């Protein structure tokens, strides 16, 4: 499972 970017969860 790849790690998400710092901002991947921001709208």
């Amino acid at each position, epitope marked *: 499972l*790849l790690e998400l970017d710092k901002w991947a969860s921001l709208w």
Partner: antibody
Amino acid sequence: RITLKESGPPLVKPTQTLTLTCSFSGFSLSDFGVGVGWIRQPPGKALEWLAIIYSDDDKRYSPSLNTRLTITKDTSKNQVVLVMTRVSPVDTATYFCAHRRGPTTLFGVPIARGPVNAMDVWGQGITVTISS
Amino acid sequence: ALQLTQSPSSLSASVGDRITITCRASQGVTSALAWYRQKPGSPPQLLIYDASSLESGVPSRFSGSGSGTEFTLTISTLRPEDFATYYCQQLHFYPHTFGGGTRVDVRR
């Protein structure tokens, strides 16, 4: 407006440590969510992502080089340093530092991801050769 | 592990031409895709961020499209300074990844 410049040794011997410094102007690393990243380009080859550090001291490394890479910052000096240990000739490349924008904020709180999705200003690049 | 595949890896064209380059991601990267132009001896220069947003100061002939796994960069009217190598980069997953590049040269 934003400028970045890499400095370091042009020549390093195998097994030694390479230290590159990025000095910048036009932004501050205390700006919310800002990043400074490193990318390299081996002679005749494509761009390769190395590492990133953010204003909150969050750091990420290329998984295949994370044993040899260390990224650090000095916010009052407007400098970011990349340290690479145990170099070999495979590490001969042009090294670029680059700026990543933080999110669109209103009242200092983020309202939009957009702008972060690129490295928007790059330094000129520094050529480093590893050889004995 | 994320792969970005650029196509074609090479193309030729002529001033005034319209060209299209595509990037496919092995996994969805939402809109987190940037396009760059690099001339020999120079650093990459940002054209398009967030898949379709035109970077300030970039000529209007550049445009980007797509979301998820499939992305396109379009130059409506090739100019002399556009003969160069183009890269995509995804910023949705760590590590950030660049594509292999697409070299655009003068046709004869």
